Design a protein around this nucleic acid. Sequence first.
DNA 1: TGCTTCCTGCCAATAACG
DNA 2: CGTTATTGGCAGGAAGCA
Length: 116
Amino acid sequence: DHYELIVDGRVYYICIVCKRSYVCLTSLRRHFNIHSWEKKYPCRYCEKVFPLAQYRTKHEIHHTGERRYQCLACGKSFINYQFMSSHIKSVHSQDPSGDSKLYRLHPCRSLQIRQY
DNA sequence: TGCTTCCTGCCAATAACG
DNA sequence: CGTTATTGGCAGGAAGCA
Ligand SMILES: [Cl-]
Ligand SMILES: [Zn+2]
Ligand SMILES: [Zn+2]
Ligand SMILES: [Zn+2]
């Protein structure tokens, strides 16, 4: 499934197939589905299948049109981080990865996923 | 060259377990 | 039914793309 590389006490897990390296073994296993397709994640709204559960989730939010990311400076909402970020940078000349929280991520309500 | 999707360290929520 | 194992959400940078 994988092998290990250790440099300066640091442990990395190497994918047998593509030789990508991971700090986290769980990352390796998650990534490896791409090669093996042991598990499948079918979009419940269309024919598409995904090698990662989170890819399907992001895809399914596109079908529902829920806009979970809201700019706190003007109230506009966006379907993902990327649209929200580029809005805030270009319209508000600010960075949401900065020290201030410039946005809110709402709970997913248009489908059923894990709640924080 | 701006959408669009992908990626992975981290770890909370969920599941399996015994 | 607590304890241990797994799943997958998330940020935000990278990669892909027409
Ligand atoms: Cl919404
Ligand atoms: Zn690989
Ligand atoms: Zn779909
Ligand atoms: Zn705004």
